[PDB]
Design a binder for this molecule. Structure first.
Ligand SMILES: [Zn+2]
Length: 205
Protein backbone atom coordinates (compact mmCIF):
# COMPACT_ATOMS: atom_id res chain seq x y z
CA UNK A 1 0.00 0.00 0.00
CA UNK A 2 0.97 3.67 -0.23
CA UNK A 3 3.80 3.85 2.32
CA UNK A 4 4.10 6.65 4.87
CA UNK A 5 7.73 7.37 5.70
CA UNK A 6 7.14 9.41 8.86
CA UNK A 7 4.97 9.20 11.98
CA UNK A 8 3.25 12.03 13.86
CA UNK A 9 4.23 10.32 17.11
CA UNK A 10 7.29 8.95 18.88
CA UNK A 11 6.60 6.17 21.38
CA UNK A 12 8.17 6.49 24.81
CA UNK A 13 11.25 4.35 25.46
CA UNK A 14 11.16 4.97 29.22
CA UNK A 15 11.45 1.92 31.48
CA UNK A 16 8.27 1.23 33.46
CA UNK A 17 7.85 -1.89 35.60
CA UNK A 18 4.26 -1.14 36.55
CA UNK A 19 1.91 -3.06 38.82
CA UNK A 20 3.35 -6.44 37.79
CA UNK A 21 7.05 -5.64 38.04
CA UNK A 22 7.67 -6.13 34.33
CA UNK A 23 11.31 -6.56 33.35
CA UNK A 24 13.32 -8.08 30.52
CA UNK A 25 15.96 -10.76 30.79
CA UNK A 26 18.54 -12.02 28.33
CA UNK A 27 20.00 -15.53 28.18
CA UNK A 28 23.68 -14.74 27.81
CA UNK A 29 26.39 -12.19 27.20
CA UNK A 30 29.01 -14.43 25.62
CA UNK A 31 30.87 -13.23 22.54
CA UNK A 32 32.15 -16.32 20.72
CA UNK A 33 32.60 -16.11 16.95
CA UNK A 34 29.74 -18.59 16.65
CA UNK A 35 27.28 -16.40 18.55
CA UNK A 36 24.14 -15.50 16.61
CA UNK A 37 22.57 -13.35 19.33
CA UNK A 38 24.12 -11.91 22.49
CA UNK A 39 23.45 -9.12 24.98
CA UNK A 40 25.67 -6.55 26.67
CA UNK A 41 24.50 -5.70 30.22
CA UNK A 42 26.77 -2.64 30.39
CA UNK A 43 25.46 -1.24 27.10
CA UNK A 44 21.90 -2.62 27.37
CA UNK A 45 22.36 -3.60 23.75
CA UNK A 46 21.67 -6.73 21.74
CA UNK A 47 24.04 -7.82 18.96
CA UNK A 48 22.57 -10.33 16.52
CA UNK A 49 22.80 -11.65 12.97
CA UNK A 50 20.29 -11.22 10.14
CA UNK A 51 17.12 -13.30 10.66
CA UNK A 52 18.63 -15.35 13.50
CA UNK A 53 16.65 -16.29 16.61
CA UNK A 54 16.77 -13.67 19.38
CA UNK A 55 15.46 -14.94 22.75
CA UNK A 56 14.07 -12.26 25.08
CA UNK A 57 12.86 -13.19 28.57
CA UNK A 58 9.78 -11.64 30.14
CA UNK A 59 9.82 -11.39 33.94
CA UNK A 60 6.99 -10.36 36.26
CA UNK A 61 6.58 -10.26 40.04
CA UNK A 62 2.94 -11.36 39.81
CA UNK A 63 0.70 -13.00 37.20
CA UNK A 64 -0.98 -10.44 34.93
CA UNK A 65 -4.66 -10.86 33.90
CA UNK A 66 -5.81 -13.11 31.03
CA UNK A 67 -5.64 -11.41 27.65
CA UNK A 68 -2.36 -9.68 28.44
CA UNK A 69 -0.13 -9.14 25.40
CA UNK A 70 3.48 -8.34 24.52
CA UNK A 71 4.35 -5.88 21.74
CA UNK A 72 7.70 -5.16 20.09
CA UNK A 73 8.40 -2.02 18.04
CA UNK A 74 11.56 -0.56 16.53
CA UNK A 75 12.40 3.14 16.42
CA UNK A 76 15.57 4.94 15.34
CA UNK A 77 17.83 5.75 18.28
CA UNK A 78 18.98 9.12 16.96
CA UNK A 79 16.45 11.89 17.73
CA UNK A 80 17.01 13.17 14.19
CA UNK A 81 15.49 10.03 12.64
CA UNK A 82 13.03 9.33 15.47
CA UNK A 83 9.93 10.18 13.45
CA UNK A 84 10.94 7.99 10.50
CA UNK A 85 9.08 4.68 10.47
CA UNK A 86 11.49 1.76 10.80
CA UNK A 87 10.88 -0.63 7.90
CA UNK A 88 12.77 -3.17 5.80
CA UNK A 89 14.93 -2.07 2.86
CA UNK A 90 13.66 -2.51 -0.72
CA UNK A 91 15.71 -5.67 -1.26
CA UNK A 92 14.38 -7.52 1.79
CA UNK A 93 10.84 -6.20 1.42
CA UNK A 94 10.86 -7.71 -2.08
CA UNK A 95 12.75 -11.00 -1.60
CA UNK A 96 9.67 -13.12 -0.75
CA UNK A 97 11.04 -14.46 2.54
CA UNK A 98 7.75 -14.17 4.40
CA UNK A 99 6.85 -17.08 6.67
CA UNK A 100 3.21 -16.73 5.68
CA UNK A 101 2.39 -14.56 8.70
CA UNK A 102 4.74 -11.58 8.68
CA UNK A 103 4.02 -8.82 6.15
CA UNK A 104 7.16 -8.21 4.02
CA UNK A 105 7.79 -4.66 5.28
CA UNK A 106 8.12 -5.63 8.97
CA UNK A 107 11.65 -5.56 10.45
CA UNK A 108 10.79 -7.50 13.60
CA UNK A 109 9.17 -10.93 13.48
CA UNK A 110 8.26 -13.50 16.14
CA UNK A 111 8.93 -17.17 15.42
CA UNK A 112 7.19 -20.30 16.64
CA UNK A 113 3.92 -18.61 17.63
CA UNK A 114 0.70 -19.23 15.69
CA UNK A 115 -1.08 -16.49 17.68
CA UNK A 116 1.28 -13.76 16.49
CA UNK A 117 -0.31 -10.61 15.07
CA UNK A 118 1.34 -7.95 12.92
CA UNK A 119 0.12 -4.37 13.00
CA UNK A 120 0.51 -1.57 10.64
CA UNK A 121 -0.93 1.29 12.63
CA UNK A 122 -3.29 3.27 10.41
CA UNK A 123 -2.90 6.31 12.67
CA UNK A 124 0.80 6.39 13.60
CA UNK A 125 2.02 4.32 10.63
CA UNK A 126 4.29 2.41 13.02
CA UNK A 127 4.92 -1.32 12.61
CA UNK A 128 4.74 -3.73 15.55
CA UNK A 129 4.43 -7.43 16.33
CA UNK A 130 2.34 -8.74 19.21
CA UNK A 131 1.84 -12.10 20.89
CA UNK A 132 -0.26 -13.17 23.86
CA UNK A 133 1.58 -13.07 27.18
CA UNK A 134 2.07 -16.68 28.25
CA UNK A 135 2.51 -17.16 32.02
CA UNK A 136 5.54 -19.37 32.82
CA UNK A 137 5.19 -23.15 32.80
CA UNK A 138 4.94 -24.78 36.21
CA UNK A 139 8.50 -24.78 37.53
CA UNK A 140 9.76 -22.05 35.21
CA UNK A 141 10.58 -18.54 36.43
CA UNK A 142 9.91 -16.69 33.18
CA UNK A 143 8.66 -16.98 29.62
CA UNK A 144 10.67 -16.22 26.49
CA UNK A 145 9.72 -14.72 23.14
CA UNK A 146 11.91 -15.39 20.12
CA UNK A 147 12.35 -12.42 17.80
CA UNK A 148 13.98 -12.21 14.36
CA UNK A 149 15.41 -9.02 12.82
CA UNK A 150 14.99 -9.22 9.03
CA UNK A 151 17.50 -6.50 7.94
CA UNK A 152 21.03 -5.69 9.11
CA UNK A 153 23.34 -2.66 9.42
CA UNK A 154 24.81 -3.40 5.99
CA UNK A 155 21.54 -3.22 4.04
CA UNK A 156 21.06 -0.59 1.34
CA UNK A 157 18.03 1.49 2.26
CA UNK A 158 15.79 0.83 5.23
CA UNK A 159 17.83 1.34 8.40
CA UNK A 160 20.77 2.36 6.20
CA UNK A 161 23.43 1.78 8.88
CA UNK A 162 21.48 3.77 11.49
CA UNK A 163 21.19 2.47 15.09
CA UNK A 164 17.78 1.38 16.39
CA UNK A 165 16.03 0.62 19.65
CA UNK A 166 13.52 -2.15 20.28
CA UNK A 167 10.74 -1.17 22.68
CA UNK A 168 8.91 -4.00 24.44
CA UNK A 169 5.56 -3.24 26.04
CA UNK A 170 3.40 -5.37 28.28
CA UNK A 171 -0.22 -4.39 27.61
CA UNK A 172 -3.64 -5.55 28.69
CA UNK A 173 -6.46 -6.63 26.38
CA UNK A 174 -7.66 -3.02 26.31
CA UNK A 175 -4.36 -1.77 24.94
CA UNK A 176 -3.35 -0.07 28.18
CA UNK A 177 0.32 0.07 29.18
CA UNK A 178 1.29 -2.33 31.98
CA UNK A 179 5.05 -2.19 31.57
CA UNK A 180 7.83 -1.10 29.23
CA UNK A 181 11.49 -1.83 28.59
CA UNK A 182 13.83 -1.16 25.72
CA UNK A 183 17.28 -2.03 24.45
CA UNK A 184 19.43 -0.95 21.53
CA UNK A 185 19.92 -3.47 18.74
CA UNK A 186 22.77 -3.90 16.27
CA UNK A 187 22.13 -6.44 13.55
CA UNK A 188 25.50 -7.37 12.09
CA UNK A 189 27.74 -10.11 10.71
CA UNK A 190 29.92 -10.63 13.79
CA UNK A 191 27.86 -9.85 16.94
CA UNK A 192 30.47 -11.35 19.25
CA UNK A 193 33.38 -9.30 17.95
CA UNK A 194 31.30 -6.11 17.85
CA UNK A 195 30.04 -6.50 21.42
CA UNK A 196 33.47 -7.35 22.79
CA UNK A 197 34.91 -4.26 21.07
CA UNK A 198 32.03 -1.92 21.92
CA UNK A 199 32.25 -2.95 25.57
CA UNK A 200 35.96 -2.17 25.38
CA UNK A 201 35.14 1.24 23.87
CA UNK A 202 32.78 1.93 26.79
CA UNK A 203 35.41 0.93 29.33
CA UNK A 204 37.75 3.54 27.85
CA UNK A 205 34.96 6.12 27.49
ZN1 LIG B 1 17.46 -5.20 4.39
Amino acid sequence: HHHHHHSSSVPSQKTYQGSYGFRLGFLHSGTAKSVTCTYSPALNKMFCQLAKTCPVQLWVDSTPPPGTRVRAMAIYKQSQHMTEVVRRCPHHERCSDSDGLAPPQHLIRVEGNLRVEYLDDRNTFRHSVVVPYEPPEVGSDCTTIHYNYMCNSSCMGGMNRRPILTIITLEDSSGNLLGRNSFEVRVCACPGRDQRTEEENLRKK
